[PDB]
Amino acid sequence: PQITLWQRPIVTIKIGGQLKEALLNTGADDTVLEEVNLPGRWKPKLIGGIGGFVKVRQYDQVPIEICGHKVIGTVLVGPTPTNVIGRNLMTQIGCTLNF
Amino acid sequence: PQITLWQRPIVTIKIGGQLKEALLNTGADDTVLEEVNLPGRWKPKLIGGIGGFVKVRQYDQVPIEICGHKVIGTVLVGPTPTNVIGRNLMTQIGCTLNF
Numbered sequence: 001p002q003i004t005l006w007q008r009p010i011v012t013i014k015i016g017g018q019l020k021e022a023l024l025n026t027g028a029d030d031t032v033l034e035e036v037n038l039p040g041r042w043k044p045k046l047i048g049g050i051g052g053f054v055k056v057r058q059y060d061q062v063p064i065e066i067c068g069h070k071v072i073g074t075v076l077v078g079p080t081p082t083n084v085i086g087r088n089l090m091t092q093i094g095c096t097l098n099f
Numbered sequence: 100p101q102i103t104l105w106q107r108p109i110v111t112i113k114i115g116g117q118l119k120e121a122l123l124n125t126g127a128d129d130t131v132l133e134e135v136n137l138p139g140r141w142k143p144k145l146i147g148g149i150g151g152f153v154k155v156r157q158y159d160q161v162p163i164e165i166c167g168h169k170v171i172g173t174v175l176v177g178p179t180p181t182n183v184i185g186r187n188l189m190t191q192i193g194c195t196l197n198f
């Protein structure tokens with residue numbers, strides 16, 4: 001799709017057998033989702049850095065469907081005010097900024 | 100331009116007679132720049148909302164050139180870790196997300 005930016009670019013995703021919504025965020029390096037039970041291995045990771053850090057669980061090579069595009073990438077699971085698809089997964093789906 | 104997202108989408112801008120760099124951030128509603136002297140009227144605005152708010156100066160209808168595209172939009176001037184071009188100015192330059 002071509003998504004204009006008059007509203008927040010919120011898309012539907014499928015992850016961990018769940019349907020969720022997330023924001024396509026070119027300002028975010030990483031993808032951070034709340035409340036997903038993913039199977040397989042993880043390691044803790046500190047993100048943010050303003051006011052302290054936030055600890056999340058880093059799962060590598062997670063299958064995720066974004067707006068119908070099935071890809072694989074690192075998903076950080078932990079507290080976040082909004083589910084965010086970061087550049088790491090936008091590259092996988094071939095998403096570009098165009099003007 | 101078509102901008103892939105393997106690196107941070109940092110672009111050159113011209114604002115208030117100065118060259119600056121800023122991040123194209125589809126996760127940001129508003130454009131927030133640090134250290135620009137803009138002429139004409141402003142009003143204070145509270146932004147963020149996590150840990151407290153940050154106060155910035157809101158300047159409406161500011162001429163700004165972004166990656167060579169001359170547009171007009173609201174620019175918030177105040178503290179920010181990164182100069183950010185938000186959706187408000189990405190709409191003006193006709194920037195879309197495409198995949």
Ligand SMILES: C#CCNC(=O)[C@@H](Cc1ccccc1)NC(=O)C[C@H](O)[C@H](Cc1ccccc1)NC(=O)[C@@H](NC(=O)c1ccccn1)C(C)C
Pocket residue numbers: 025027028029048049050080081082083084124126127129146147179180181182183
């Ligand atoms: C007004 C305003 C700017 N941002 C906001 O209010 C936040 C709130 C939010 C947090 C998580 C998910 C969705 C939304 N929204 C964003 O989309 C974040 C923004 O796209 C990006 C993503 C990011 C996060 C951490 C470090 C570096 C970059 N930017 C930022 O968050 C900004 N800097 C930060 O230091 C920061 C750190 C931790 C939380 C919030 N902010 C700077 C770039 C100015």
